Design a protein around this ligand. Sequence first.
Ligand SMILES: Nc1nnc(-c2cccs2)[nH]1
Lengths: 39, 155
Amino acid sequence: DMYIERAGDITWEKDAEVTGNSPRLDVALDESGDFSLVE
Amino acid sequence: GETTDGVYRVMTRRLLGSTQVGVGVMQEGVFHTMWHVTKGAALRSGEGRLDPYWGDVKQDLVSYCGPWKLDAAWDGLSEVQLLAVPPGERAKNIQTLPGIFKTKDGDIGAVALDYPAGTSGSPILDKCGRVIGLYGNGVVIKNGSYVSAITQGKR
Ligand SMILES: Nc1nnc(-c2cccs2)[nH]1
């Protein structure tokens, strides 16, 4: 069986660490909910 | 069980010790997570039970105790925050400018951040703290890096 445990409030943090890029990708979504790259 | 709004870890004792299989959002009395985290199974919250109410494998989403309540959307321009809840580690906010997944059926925001699989279900928020989707369903791109869709339901 699965159980849940609280981990925190949902709030925006002022001055949080800023990272990650912003790629623009062509993708396909199948019936199983899997994303794949289209080339 | 605990009904307080917030972010929650989804745990199991089926495997070795106590394992974090994912994360979810409690909002307006409804628990929201990704389908691949629970596979639609019932959940325990203290001595209480949370039963599935709605779910869809293709969207990779599930809600418990009521219908999907999260309806905020990324504005297509601004930075957002992943409120990452990794296994055995404190909740941490990461700010990022989303990229885009372009599909035959329209565009969706995407975040290029890599966390353990048990981080799936962590909420992505806008500047007002509204949940614009959940992290954890995405793809491995050319250079081997992970990019998650910003997955949002329909209210
Ligand atoms: N190949 C790979 N790298 N990161 C991942 C995931 C992160 C959150 C859910 S799956 N999967």
